[PDB]
């Protein structure tokens, strides 16, 4: 019966600004404490800031890596919570929640100013930040080595570095090599560029008799790459 | 009036959660 | 930076398990606990000394002792496979709030598997481009939750690390990878670099050096 709908999120270049909205219904908003919590991609929840209630003068406290750029405000006449953001950066991208903040203080064993819990949560609104334009991948070989090889088997891949955006398809020897092949998911570099790595395991008695090549393909830039890999020296 | 202003400051403390938590902890001991 | 948690904890269906939060502020403040399934809003589980919100099953129990908090599930169910975050004051006496690393609770559908670690040094080509990248690959492990860390000589490395989320393989096992970006001067200055992985108490560490 308690409903919180976040909106006002989307794509923006770094240095830009944004204003998030969060409706409220099913509870007395005019006095509730409210909190903004964000979840970066793949990472956990991170407390942003919280605006208190009338007994506290509508005072606000902000997270350290955030204080100075953001400002929280509230319109109790319409039950709306606002988060203005300035000088946005890539780090700031992520899901943004508004949460009804409750308060706890165990009189006998508590310590001021007590704790705060987050009763209800909205589905949240996704923010995204990029200064990225399409880029082609820069392939790099992941050479084996006598120190690297474990048993008669040897492990070898490619490094698709600094490209943008997804997706990227990889094969080895033009698909003729499927046994022992596994292509990893892509990491999203804080710089705003994707990178991933393919890899295949093979006999070490085959390095001479066989030549190994990874077939990268980046349609988003009309780019294809073939990279030969060879033992170290 | 000068003295009455002071009692107004106390009036808020007891309705300021943050000031409260320091009132209660003051009583605990 | 303030509160710590386990990253990858598991338990079998119907057994018992406990995940813990840790931080010098827990010596003075309670902690809240939240469940988070991907694509679903967080849910408050437990807070204060003893407060379970309505609609929560009774099998969830919290507890506090010293600078540690702890959540407990008795007779874990399948629907409890999720992520759990603790939350408290960043410091004793602060007005703020903070979360922990979070913990993935794997409801075991598979026998546990140990990750195979592989570490590559910067390639000859990438150095000529005046760059230095280290790739630490992880494969064939369950539950799909590890903890990676990079070390230069003895000292750990803070900046320059990125690591993917674990992903299934062709054989239902999980895989993930961590990268370390360096400058050709750093790579040639230190004696060695090391990639530590941690999975269910176990911890592997592969090492490489500029030489050879």
CB pairs under 8 A between A and C: 139
The alpha carbon of C182 is separated from its chain's Cα centroid by a whole number of angstroms, namely: 23
* Chain C contact set for A100 (CB, 8 A): none
Q: Which of residues C44, C77, C109 is at a domain's end?
A: C109
Chain A positions in Cβ-Cβ contact with residue B18 (cut-off 8 Å): 56, 112-113
Nearest-CA distance B9 → chain A (Å): 12
Q: How do the domains of chain A map onto residue ranges?
A: 1-131, 132-228
Residue A23 to residue A4: CA distance in whole angstroms:
5
E strands of A115-222, at which residues?
115-121, 125-129, 138-142, 153-163, 169-172, 181-183, 187-189, 193-203, 212-218
Three-state secondary structure call for residue A116: strand
Residue located via tokens 């099953």: C57
| Same domain as C85, residue C115 | no
* CA distance to partner chain C, nearest, from residue A108 (Å): 11
Q: Tell which CATH classification among 3.40.630.40, 2.60.40.10, 1.10.357.10, 3.40.109.10 matches the domain A1-131.
A: 2.60.40.10
Nearest beta carbon to residue B16 from set A55, A108, A111 = A55
Q: What distances in angstroms separate CA A222 from CA A7, A130, A174, A219, one per listed residue?
A: 35, 21, 18, 4
| H-run or E-run covering A71 | strand A70-75
Q: Among partner residues B17, B22, B25, which is closest to A56 by beta-carbon distance? A: B17
Determine the distance in angstroms separating the CA of B27 from the nearest CA of chain A, rounded to an integer.
9
Considering only residues 126 to 165 of chain C, which have any Cβ-Cβ distance to chain A shorter than 8 Å? 126, 133, 135, 137, 139, 162-165
Q: What are phi and psi of B9, to 5 degrees?
A: -60, -45
Same domain? For C92 and C122 the reply is no
Task: For B1-29, give one letter per residue: b (16+ CB within 10 A) or e.
Answer: eeeeeeeeeeeeeeebbebbbeeebeeee
Chains in touch with C (3+ beta-carbon pairs under 8 Å) read A
Considering its fold, how many domains does chain B have in total?
1
| Residues C132 and C84 both lie in one domain | no
- Residues C88, C117 within the same domain: no
End-to-end CA gap in chain B: 34
Picking from B16, C87, C94, the residue whose alpha carbon sits closest to that of residue A112 is C94
Q: Do the chains contact at B28 and A107, CB–CB below 8 Å? A: yes
How many domains is chain C partitioned into structurally?
2
- Domain of C169 in residue numbering reads as 110-212
In angstroms and rounded to an integer, the radius of gyration of the C-alpha atoms of chain C is 20
* C46 shares its domain with C91: yes
C-chain residues within 8 Å CB-CB of A113?
89, 93-95
Q: Are residues C42 and C93 in the same domain?
A: yes
Q: What is the resolution of this structure in A?
A: 3.3
Handedness of CA C76, C77, C78, C82 (dihedral sign): negative
Host H or E run for residue A37: strand A33-39
| Inter-chain touch A142–C167, beta carbons under 8 Å | no
Specify the experimental method: X-ray
Q: Which domain holds residue B5?
A: 1-29
Sequence-distant contacts of A143-148: CB under 8 A, at least 24 apart: A143/A229, A143/A230, A143/A231, A143/A232, A143/C120, A143/C123, A143/C124, A144/A204, A144/A207, A144/A231, A144/A232, A145/A231, A145/A232, A145/C212, A147/C212, A148/C118, A148/C120
Residues C76 and C131 in one domain: no
CATH topology of domain A132-228: Immunoglobulin-like (2.60.40)
Q: Residue length, chain C?
A: 212
Both structure tokens of A139? 């392939």
Which positions in chain A have a beta carbon within 8 angstroms of at least one beta carbon in chain B? 52, 55-57, 103, 105, 107-108, 110-114
A102 phi/psi in degrees, rounded to 5: -100, 175
| A112–B15 CB contact, under 8 Å | no
Which candidate, A45, A29, A41, A8, places its Cα nearest to that of C42? A45
CATH number of the structural domain spanning residue C179: 2.60.40.10
For residue A135, the 8-state DSSP code is B
Sorted by sequence, the CB contacts under 8 Å of residue A37 that are 6+ apart come out as A45, A46, A47, A48, A96, A97, A98, A99, A118, C42, C99
């Amino acid at each position: 019966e308690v409903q919180l709908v976040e909106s006002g999120g989307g794509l923006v270049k770094p240095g830009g600004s944004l204003r998030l909205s969060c409706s409220a219904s099913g509870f007395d908003f005019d006095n509730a404490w409210m909190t903004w919590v964000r979840q970066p991609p793949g990472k956990g929840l991170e407390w942003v800031g919280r605006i208190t209630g009338p007994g506290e003068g509508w005072s606000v406290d902000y997270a350290a890596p955030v204080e100075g750029r953001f400002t929280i405000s509230r319109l109790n006449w319409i039950n709306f919570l606002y988060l203005e953001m300035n000088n946005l950066r890539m780090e700031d991208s992520g899901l943004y929640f508004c949460a009804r903040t409750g308060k706890y203080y165990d009189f006998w064993s508590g310590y001021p100013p007590g704790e705060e819990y987050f009763q209800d949560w909205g589905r949240g609104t996704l923010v995204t930040v990029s200064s990225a334009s399409t880029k082609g991948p820069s392939v790099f070989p992941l050479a084996p080595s006598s120190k690297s090889t474990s048993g008669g088997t040897a492990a070898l891949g490619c490094l698709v570095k600094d490209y943008f955006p997804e997706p990227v398809t990889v094969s080895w020897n033009s698909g003729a090599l499927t046994s022992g092949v596994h292509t990893f998911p892509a990491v999203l570099q804080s710089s705003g560029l994707y990178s991933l790595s393919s890899v295949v395991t093979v006999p070490s008695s085959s390095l001479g008799t066989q030549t190994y090549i990874c077939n990268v393909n980046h349609k988003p830039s009309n780019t294809k790459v073939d990279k030969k890999v060879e033992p170290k020296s | 009036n000068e003295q009455e202003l002071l009692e107004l400051d106390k009036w808020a403390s007891l309705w300021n959660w943050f000031d409260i938590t320091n009132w209660l902890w003051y009583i605990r001991r | 930076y303030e509160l710590t948690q386990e990253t990858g904890v598991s338990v079998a269906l119907g057994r018992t398990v406990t995940i813990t939060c840790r931080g010098d502020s827990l010596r003075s403040h309670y902690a809240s606990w939240y469940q988070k399934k991907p694509g679903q809003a967080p849910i408050l589980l437990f807070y204060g000394k003893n407060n379970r919100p309505s609609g929560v099953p009774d099998r969830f129990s919290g507890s506090a002792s010293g600078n540690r908090a702890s959540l407990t599930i008795s007779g874990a169910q399948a629907e409890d496979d999720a992520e759990y975050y603790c939350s408290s004051r960043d410091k004793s006496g602060s007005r703020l709030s903070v979360f922990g690393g979070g913990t993935k609770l794997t409801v075991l559908s598979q026998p546990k598997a140990a990750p195979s670690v592989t570490l590559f040094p910067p390639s000859s080509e990438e150095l000529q481009a005046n760059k230095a990248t280290l790739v630490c690959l992880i494969s064939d492990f369950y539950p799909g939750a590890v903890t990676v860390a990079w070390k230069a000589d003895s000292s750990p490395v803070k900046a320059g690390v990125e690591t993917t989320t674990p992903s299934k393989q062709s054989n239902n096992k999980y895989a993930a990878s961590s990268y370390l970006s360096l400058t050709p001067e750093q790579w040639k200055s230190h004696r060695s670099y090391s990639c530590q992985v941690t999975h269910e108490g176990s911890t592997v560490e592969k090492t490489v050096a500029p030489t050879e």
